[PDB]
């Protein structure tokens, strides 16, 4: 690890300058006790110069994000399908670093914005660093990389006033979506729960593009990368996400950091779909088109290995802020395809690191370094940290005996372009007609959602498009939505007081695909790390005893228990003042605390009605809620929460209460609490 | 015409060109065949993507989140009797300005409504050079020596292992620093008051913080404090409102300012000074060099120098607001520095830090930084040099350029000059003046000057933040410092966190008060123009829409911003219930034709369960004027648990009588009787 | 290493301090700032050549190019969450740097020059008086060279005004080259004082001749010339001189061709007398007259020169070099030749070969 060598311990010692001279840094040097500061105060200037220069440009996209270290372990020797060294043996372990992100927001924007999310993975392999720079949505908005600045200018804030932050809910974004119909598939995913995932751990990763697996014999197959969550799939609801953005902008980064610290590091199966080169145009679309998925019914997933994140960074800036991913970080055994989106990405990620790092030696930062020797004739540049011993860095040479030697298909385990690849035809700036169906797959996706998930997606579009001020953009939006689904256009039009266009059935169909629905993906496979708020009181000795019994029972099963009361003490984690329903996956009231839920309840220690609002918000957002103790009746009445409700619990016995409540936590959301269009 | 019209680029017509004027396209990559790989010879692709890849610059090291506008400063008099400053030398003399407002801790995407200190930075483009006053909305600063700035800022910014939490002092490190560095107490009390969560940039004041000098053409000097006094009045959010608003509208302050300017409600401030003699530096019971102290207005009254009005929004946010580079080193003849060790070190920081932001030394050439008078100097070259200098002899002294440019000084060329009565005497020391040692009296002065509900809000802010501090040593240390300002504050805060306050230490306790620091105490707002009224209506009753239309006409006559809310958009409805929130309004009105939407059984797929009532309830609980217009008020007020006889609760059949009452409620702004007191 | 080394007078250690020299004072600012230009970022002290050889303990963080992974997640002072580390270093603890505690300041805040700085001419005259006569001539001749290339007549006149304040004789001798009259003597700062240690010509023979360069001019024509050169090489290399044998073409024992050779390549030049024919009144292998020109240039520039082997008149007469000149050597004995020649290398320059005013 080039990180180990660069760790700096300041647990002991006297303060020094950056050149090791012991100094102080608390008072400026002045001409007299009430005098002006001296230019000769080098202690002042070195410290303030460093401060003045701490910042670097944020990433042009995915500025908001968080990372962790872990390991990838291969399940098999995959030599039969790829030459890739990190996949060449059962049990072979490769260190990883992953960064998760949103896309549009700046640094400091909220984790729980509605957005596409990044899932970028570095494998520090024994044949070089290999990055899979993916997203949580398997399809992209655009079909050619040259359009990326158009997409991103349109979804980022309007450039006269820089409003709005971290949101596509503005005219320019919906203008672009409605004028560039390729956007429909990713737009449908972003308007689904996939736009507001419950955590980084509860979302999948996708390479998006078709890539190639290349064997040592030169043969190739076409692949798609899928990183399948072992925590299950889960979403927030929009109203909840909006509050959580305010209450805790750091929710996803905190969730990941806490899961790793608690020994619950998240896991994914790293999978591929594998298909023959001859199938590029066999599935009714082009595998070069990054707006399309291969339905799992046409190509099943093969599990290649386990990705586990299990160690947080030491210094966020040095590791997470400075990690510089590139799809150009490729290894022998993998190749590109002629996807015009992927093709232009390769240029962008090498160039942009010059902006971020301010100079060309960014691969020398410890987080970017490889775990194998570097042998090349790259030299000099600002921030050069190496002292090269070869004073003949040119090829061909005799004065360094021909080293470094060329690597290729037959030498030094070189990367090689898949030798079956060809190109033929005119040099054109033309789109393939095979890319022209922008609407069938958006429909496939929409069909594959549950009825309440379809409603959530319609309601997300109703929310955003109602904030578009241009009547002509809103009309154009309905024109494009109508090509995917007349019913979606009609339901969205109803919220904005416009008429939908007449049905246009060209791309309408009834087909569905497995594995894209969140609500449909069944109970969560584990409830470890899920958050339980216990609403108690210091008023009643019994209320703190009830809380402490629930705590033992719930903590047994790996739940993160927060006991909330008016004030802190032994056994109480948080005050009502700091508590919010967005902080919990389920909420339990101990019946000992009933008096806090009365309409007349008031305290200077928390805002009017806070205890009941927590319970009501949790219920209205679909969470498991209940009252534990015996007068379960009374609290449920104040909340207008029906005792016979799905995901509403009411037990005198703590043992019975928890057994029922933990099933609700796995169900995770009670969708019968949301109204559907007729 | 904008003051920067010479630099404007119009793209309302024309064909796409490269940056060198070659007509091009930018929508499809050049490929070897229609399904081929992209070509390196595609310069169209690479120039567009290189530009995109390099769009970002480092955010400001502090004050990264902010927003700006153009306007005019107008002098009320000829101030040559106190200052040589040209921009102040005649009655009615006009100078263009640019102002940026900001928070301090958050990154450039963080919420406007975080609790924080705020920036108020003003550039005067004077006829004798650019003059900047780089101020805050709080008149005192945390620390007494610039060399400590990185300590303060590291402690309040996110913890550097995981970069949590964003835009908040509510974590261990910050309260560790506050409790170990007692100078922080005065600013801390201001930040924990409503001055930490201002209602808008227009509803806060600006302060230079430091003592400066005014210097006459005869060389005599006076000591001054700058105060920019809002002509809009002072107003705050409540914390539990600010937290939701951070999620519902991270852009609230920048939108409020932008909208005020577009509506012809450009905000205004009286630019004022306190003026005292050089002999009064240590006359008021503290040192005028100490930036943790105010001069109570009872000791030195404000003199109004002129009017600051902001009335023009930027054309390009990045080019004007993101790129504006303020400096206290931007000083003009007639002003001088003081030996305040905080101001002293700032002068270094703001010249250096622009190298980080701009990437090169020619940042004063950016349009927003250029002066409006000629530049004559021997500065040359550097990256990004825009000027073509004719003078081939840029050294002094010269004969080959006839001795030009000529030296400017007190006696020639209207030169800047150091106040000539200034001296220094004594040892060259890294020592703090004992005159700086009282860190507690003025925090007590401030606390004493707040109303009772205001004192409660400040206690509650401290209770909120300190309850989130994990360390029991840090919480005890915080109570030790707060106890030196006020035993009552320490006891009340300690009650929320389950510790005992230490015994009273009355060394610094006193009962003195000072005018002009209280928000609650500053009486009704002088204008209600721009304040926001939400009218909750329904499409289900044509008569509810008629009530809303009649209310709109009458409220808009008085310059209120009216939003009619209903289930769906149509003519006369601005916003759906789905996108509406009480944080969007300064007052809420329900038309009694919509009373059915407030029923417990009310449900719609078009908005979250209970949304209409929650808007009314939140508005009431946050202290806003609320009412029901039309005569049938019982169903709504009873559903909301709001008493018809409450102060700032309105029930009238007559639209005219409703609006007359409700408008007095908007001027009152907050009904503080709805908040519990210890 | 060399291009990236970033020196600073702000790189100071306990036991050294600054003075109020206004030139030094402003340097402290410049050298910290300028490394931002060179490095493009604030972490230039992390470059290997700039790193210290002792631990770094401070709360500097982040910046482009940050190489460290800091473990201390509480980088502020004062702190309890990192137990108050790093600790402040000062005069009394941790071997801190400290400003000399006797230093004071007193007076107005001024942009004024100390009148104690105003004598700009006495020390130039002290320096000039301390040079030997030939060295004064060299200095006059450097000023005559440079000032003759100044196009402005008024600049040239202003230069003579200032030079005249140091020395009227300098002004007169410079003026003679540029066709101007010197201004009348102004004796305010004239004096006859001298100081030791500033003269090069007067600093006596070099204390070592190791590394000094001896060019041996030979020929491939005459196998005996190559034999003479080989014998001379052996004798000179024994004493640590760097020997170059020059001939028309390369072969074993010949280092350079006459085409690439120049008198500026040598501190001393020896012709072996077997090569005397090359010193007469042409070849496609080198420019016309090259062998003789190397000898003549070496002589004109003051170097020790000579002929080894016993026959010197043909070479020295072709060169217009007198056999009895100081720093001109002729011996048949290689040992004798080298003993005499080495004394000449230590003398280094024979300054009797330069004309004086
Ligand atoms: C032509 C430009 C372009 C295009 C078409 C894309 N991107 Fe990209 N992307 C960039 C240009 C870029 C960039 C400007 O080069 C960034 C900013 C920071 C960086 O390292 O690269 C970036 C960053 C970035 C990151 C953040 C990595 C990190 O955490 O540091 C992720 C996850 C993605 N992108 C993912 C994608 C996916 C899955 C794409 C489509 C399949 C995609 N991008 C298309
Ligand atoms: C020694 C360093 C230091 C100290 C003691 C302070 N600041 Fe500062 N401040 C900076 C170093 C700095 C900076 C790093 O130089 C920034 C970042 C961006 C910039 O141009 O300057 C800055 C930015 C900055 C801005 C943003 C200007 C804009 O909108 O672009 C404001 C309003 C202030 N500061 C105000 C203050 C006030 C009122 C202070 C105390 C009275 C103060 N700062 C002390
Ligand atoms: Ca827009
Ligand atoms: Ca969902
Ligand atoms: Ca740079
Ligand atoms: Ca190849
Ligand atoms: Ca902390
Ligand atoms: Ca307040």
Give the Cα separation of B102 and B110 in Å (integer): 11
- Backbone phi, psi, residue B55, to 5°: -60, -35
SS3 state at A351: helix
Question: Exposed e or buried b for every residue in A649-678, given b needs 16+ CB within 10 A?
Answer: bbbeebeebbebbbebbebbbbbebbeebe
For every residue of C150-179, DSSP letters joined together read ---HHHHHHHHHHHHHH-HHHHHHHHHHHT
Tell me if B591 sits within 8 A of B533, measured CB to CB.
no
Q: DSSP states of C76-89 as a string?
A: -SS-STTTTPSBP-
- Contact yes or no for B609/A620 (Cβ under 8 A): yes
> Which of B70, B118, B130, B136 does the annotation list as catalytic?
B136
Name the strand (E) or helix (H) holding B151: helix B149-156
| B670 CA from centroid of ligand 8 (Å) | 9
Judge contact between B367 and B4, C-beta under 8 A. yes
Kind plus residue range of the DSSP H or E element containing B459: helix B452-467
The answer on whether B236 is annotated among ligand-binding residues is yes
How far is C-alpha B272 from the geometric centre of its chain's CA atoms? 18
Distance, CA of A446 to CA of A442 (rounded, Å): 6
Resolution (A): 1.4
Q: Tell me how far apart the alpha carbons of residues B349 and A588 are, in angstroms, rounded to a whole number.
A: 52
Q: How far apart are CA B606 and CA A591, in angstroms?
A: 34
Q: Are strands A211-214 and A220-229 parallel, antiparallel or unpaired?
A: antiparallel
Ligand 2: residue of B106, B181, B317, B346 to mutate (most ligand atoms within 8 A of CB) is B346
Name the DSSP letter for residue A291. T
Q: Calculate the CA B509 to chain-centre distance.
A: 31
Q: Closest to C81 (Cβ–Cβ): which among B418, B423, B471? A: B471
Q: Which residue has the tokens 């003269």?
A: C199
Please tell me the distance between residue B62's alpha carbon and the centre of ligand 2 in angstroms: 7
Q: Are B616 and B598 in contact (CB under 8 A)?
A: yes
Positive or negative, the CA dihedral B360, B362, B365, B369 is: positive
Rounded-to-integer distance, Cα B172 and Cα B164, Å:
11
Contacts with A477 (C-beta within 8 Å, 6 or more apart), sequence order:
A174, A177, A178, A465, A468, A492
Chain B contact for C83 (CB, 8 A cutoff): no
The encoded tokens of residue C209 equal: 């001749």
Residue nearest to atom 40 of ligand 1 (CA): A140
Spatial strand order of the sheet with A625-628 comes to A574-575, A560-565, A531-535, A586-590, A625-628, A648-651
Distance CA A33, CA A36 (A): 9
In terms of Cβ atoms closer than 10 Å to its own Cβ (0-12, 13-18, 19+), residue C207 is exposed
In what helix (H) or strand (E) does residue A507 lie, and over which residues does it extend? Answer: none
Confirm whether residue A59 is marked as ligand binding: yes
Bridge-based pairing state of the strands B561-566 and B532-536 = parallel
Provide the 3-class DSSP secondary structure of residue C13.
coil
Query: Are A458 and A204 a contacting pair, CB within 8 Å?
Result: no
Q: Is residue B139 classed as helix, strand or coil in its secondary structure?
A: coil
Say which ligand is closest to the CA of A383: 5
Residue carrying the six token digits 């009873």: B638
Task: Tell how strand A267-275 and strand A220-229 pair up.
Answer: antiparallel
For residue B604, the 8-state DSSP code is B
Measured CA to CA, the distance from residue A593 to residue A534 in angstroms comes to 10
| Closest chain C residue to the Cα of B355, Cα to Cα | C36
Report how many Cβ contacts below 8 Å link chain A to chain B.
415
What is the DSSP pairing of strand B587-591 with strand B626-629? parallel
* A56 and chain C in contact, CB less than 8 A: yes
DSSP-derived pairing of the beta strands A7-8 and C69-70: parallel
User: Which backbone phi and psi does B74 adopt, to 5 degrees?
Assistant: -125, 125
Contacts of C148 (CB under 8 A, 6+ apart): C177, C178
Quote the DSSP letter at residue C247. Answer: E
Contact A359 C99 (CB under 8 A): no
Pair B552, B563: CB distance under 8 Å: no
List the determination method: X-ray
First to last CA, chain C: 48
Which strand ranges, in their side-by-side order, compose the sheet holding B587-591? Answer: B575-576, B561-566, B532-536, B587-591, B626-629, B649-652
CB neighbours of residue C158 within 10 Å: 13
Which residue's CA lies nearest to atom 18 of ligand 1? Answer: A59
Token pair of C312 as six digits: 């010197």
DSSP state of B607: B
- What is the DSSP code (8-state) at residue A19? T
User: Please, are residues A571 and A517 in contact by the beta-carbon 8 Å criterion?
Assistant: no
DSSP letters along A519-567, please? Answer: GGG-S-S--TT-EEEEE--SS-HHHHHHHHHHHHHHHHTT-EEEEEESS
Q: CB-CB: which of B159, B399, B420 is closest to C158?
A: B399
Beta strands in A404-511 (DSSP E): 427-428
Note whether A374 contacts B: Cβ–Cβ < 8 A.
Answer: no
Query: Cβ contacts (< 8 Å) between C90 and chain A: which residues?
Result: 24
Alpha-carbon distance of C250 to C263, in angstroms, equals: 18
Residues 6+ apart with CB under 8 A from A111: A64, A102, A245, A249, A250, A251, A252, A253
Query: Residue A161 Cα, ligand 3 centroid: separation in angstroms?
Result: 10
CA angle A363, A364, A370 (to 5 degrees): 70
Are A262 and A308 in contact by the 8 Å Cβ rule? The answer is no
Strands B423-429 and B335-336: unpaired
**Taking CB atoms and a 6 Å cutoff, what residues make up the pocket around ligand 2?**
A 48, 52; B 60-63, 66, 100, 102, 119, 121, 134-136, 141, 146, 149, 209-210, 291, 324-326, 342, 345-346, 349-350, 353
User: Does a cis peptide bond (omega within 30 degrees of 0) precede residue C86?
Assistant: yes
Give the C-alpha separation, B59 to A57, whole Å. Answer: 7
Whole-number Cα distances in Å, C149 to C142, C144, C177: 11, 9, 11
C81 CB neighbours in chain B (<8 A) are 172-173, 176, 471, 474
Helix residue spans in B523-670 (DSSP H): 542-557, 611-621, 634-639, 655-668
DSSP-based three-state secondary structure for A516: coil
A247:B245 CB<8 A: no
**Interatomic CA distance for residues B130 and B324, integer angstroms:** 12
Ligand nearest to the CA of A415: 6
């Amino acid at each position: 690890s080039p990180l180990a060598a660069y760790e700096v311990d300041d647990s002991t010692g006297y303060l020094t300058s950056d050149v090791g001279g012991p100094i102080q840094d608390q008072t400026s040097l002045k001409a007299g006790i009430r005098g002006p500061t001296l230019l000769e105060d080098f202690m002042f200037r070195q410290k303030i110069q460093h401060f003045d220069h701490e910042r670097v440009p944020e990433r042009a996209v995915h500025a908001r994000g968080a990372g962790a270290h872990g390991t990838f372990t291969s399940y098999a020797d995959w030599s039969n399908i790829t030459a890739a060294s990190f996949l060449n043996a059962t049990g072979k372990q490769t260190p990883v670093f992953v960064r998760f992100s949103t896309v549009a927001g700046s640094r400091g924007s909220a984790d729980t914005a509605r957005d596409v999310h990044g899932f970028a993975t570095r494998f520090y392999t024994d044949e070089g660093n290999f990055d899979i720079v993916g997203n949580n949505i398997p399809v992209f908005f655009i079909q050619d990389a040259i359009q990326f600045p158009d997409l991103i200018h349109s979804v980022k804030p309007r450039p006269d006033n820089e409003i709005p932050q971290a949101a596509a809910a503005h005219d320019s974004a919906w203008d672009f979506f409605s004028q560039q119909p390729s956007t429909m598939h990713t737009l449908f995913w972003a308007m689904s729960g996939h736009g507001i995932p419950r955590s980084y751990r509860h979302m999948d990763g996708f390479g998006v593009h078709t890539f190639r697996f290349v064997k040592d014999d030169g043969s190739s197959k076409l692949i798609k990368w899928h990183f399948k969550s072992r925590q299950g799939k889960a979403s927030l609801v929009w109203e909840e996400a909006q509050v959580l953005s305010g209450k805790n902008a750091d929710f996803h980064r905190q969730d990941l950091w806490d899961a790793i610290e608690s020994g619950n590091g998240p896991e994914w199966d790293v999978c591929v779909q594998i298909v023959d080169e001859s199938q590029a145009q066999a599935f009714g679309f082009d595998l070069l088109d990054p707006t399309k998925i291969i339905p799992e019914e046409y190509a099943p997933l093969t599990k290649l290995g386990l990705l586990k994140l299990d160690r947080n960074p030491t210094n966020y800036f040095a590791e997470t802020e400075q990690v510089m991913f590139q799809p150009g970080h490729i290894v022998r055994g993998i190749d590109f395809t002629e996807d015009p989106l992927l093709q232009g990405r390769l240029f962008s990620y090498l160039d942009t690191q010059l902006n971020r790092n301010g100079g060309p030696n960014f691969e020398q930062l410890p987080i970017n370094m490889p775990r194998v020797p570097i042998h090349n004739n790259n030299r000099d540049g600002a921030g050069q940290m190496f002292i090269h011993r070869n004073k003949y860095p040119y090829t061909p040479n005799t004065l360094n005996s021909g080293y470094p030697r060329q690597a290729n298909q037959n030498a030094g385990r070189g990367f090689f372009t898949a030798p079956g690849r060809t190109a033929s035809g005119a040099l054109v700036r033309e789109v393939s007609p095979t890319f022209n169906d922008h609407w069938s797959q958006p429909r496939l996706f929409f069909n594959s959602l549950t009825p309440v998930e379809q409603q959530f997606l319609v309601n997300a579009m109703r929310f955003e498009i109602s904030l578009v001020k241009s009547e002509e953009v809103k009309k154009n939006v309905l024109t494009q939505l109508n090509r995917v689904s007349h019913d979606v256009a009609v339901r969205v039009a109803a919220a904005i007081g416009l008429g939908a266009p007449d049905a246009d059935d060209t791309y309408y169909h009834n087909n569905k695909t497995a594995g894209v629905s969140i609500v449909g993906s069944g109970p969560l496979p584990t409830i470890k790390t899920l958050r339980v708020g216990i609403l108690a009181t210091t008023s009643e000795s019994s209320a703190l005893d009830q809380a402490a019994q629930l705590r033992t029972r719930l903590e047994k099963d790996g739940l993160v228990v927060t006991v909330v009361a008016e004030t802190l003490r032994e056994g109480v984690d948080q005050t009502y003042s700091t508590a919010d329903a967005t902080g919990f996956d389920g909420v339990v009231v101990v019946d000992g605390a009933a008096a806090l839920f009365a309409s007349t309840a008031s305290s200077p220690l928390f805002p009017t009605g806070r205890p009941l609002q927590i319970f009501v918000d949790a219920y209205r957002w679909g969470k498991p809620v209940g009252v534990c103790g015996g007068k379960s009746s009374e609290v449920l009445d104040a909340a207008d929460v029906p005792e016979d409700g799905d995901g509403v619990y009411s037990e005198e016995s703590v043992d019975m209460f928890v057994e029922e409540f933990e099933k609700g936590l796995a169900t995770f959301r009670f969708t019968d609490r949301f109204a559907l269009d007729s």
